[PDB]
Amino acid sequence: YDRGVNTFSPEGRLFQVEYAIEAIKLGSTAIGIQTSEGVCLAVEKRITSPLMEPSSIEKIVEIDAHIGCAMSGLIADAKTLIDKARVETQNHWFTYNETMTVESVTQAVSNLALQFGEEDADPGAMSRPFGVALLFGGVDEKGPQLFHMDPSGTFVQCDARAIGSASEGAQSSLQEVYHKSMTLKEAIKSSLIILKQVMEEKLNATNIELATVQPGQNFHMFTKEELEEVIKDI
């Protein structure tokens, strides 16, 4: 239309940024919880047909051996951010022989957001914001850490953050059930409980993804047996 991508509303809102933020509410619900025992990431696969293979719906991604990411919204848009996170990481290791801070990874991914434009831009520059919301979860010198990133490039550490279609109700439930000193098993169970009450379908070990980043241990995607072990309770 007449408006450019880099246009400000009379209220001071970047139009395309707000419109990309509205894209997350159509995405699947993801829930990240940070606890002293580790970071738990959960997401709903939202299977639309029995023929579709659930294993191909990858919405929790290994960023590095100590960092994972859960994406919500336009999953295709999240591929570029994931690739930049996984390339920017191992570049810090290449030059400094150390793993990045989760905050540094989230900041590097955030710098990609808002790097879009129409005129006076590079040929490889993007045309629109990334219509995806990311939940980075990892372990670093500061222990376990969970960061939330949105298409405006605003990344912020969160104790327990829910994004996606059910972000409002899941966030309310997280506020109701989160306390700072709780185990990782309790975090996983609470996240699964919150997911189960917001899914359109019925929760099972196939339509959800669960991952954990614990101190000492590496990023771990939960298998079907491990998922069934915790689902059998609730």
Q: Which residues bind other proteins (CB under 8 A)?
A: 1, 3-5, 16, 19-26, 49-53, 55-57, 74-77, 79-80, 116, 118-119, 121, 123-129, 131, 165-166, 168-169, 198, 200
Closest distance of CB 214 from other proteins, Å: 28
* Closest to other proteins by CB, 36 or 115: 115
**Residue 71 CB neighbours (<10 A):** 29
* Closest to other proteins by CB, 49 or 97: 49
Q: What is the DSSP letter of 20?
A: H
* Closest to other proteins by CB, 79 or 185: 79
Closest distance of CB 170 from other proteins, Å: 10
| Distance from C-alpha of 141 to C-alpha of 185, rounded to nearest angstrom | 22
* Closest to other proteins by CB, 51 or 176: 51
* Closest to other proteins by CB, 38 or 129: 129
| Distance from C-alpha of 110 to C-alpha of 104, rounded to nearest angstrom | 10
Closest distance of CB 51 from other proteins, Å: 5
Closest distance of CB 93 from other proteins, Å: 23
C-alpha distances (whole Å) from 58 to each of 114, 175, 181, 193 are 25, 27, 30, 21
Which two three-digit tokens encode residue 49?
Answer: 């047909």
**Residue 194 CB neighbours (<10 A):** 24
- Enclosing H/E stretch for 212: strand 208-213
Between helices 184-196 and 167-177, what is the axis angle to 10°? 140
Closest residue by Cα to residue 160 from 50, 221, 70, 44: 70
* Closest to other proteins by CB, 43 or 146: 43
Closest distance of CB 40 from other proteins, Å: 23
| Distance from C-alpha of 169 to C-alpha of 182, rounded to nearest angstrom | 21
Closest distance of CB 90 from other proteins, Å: 19
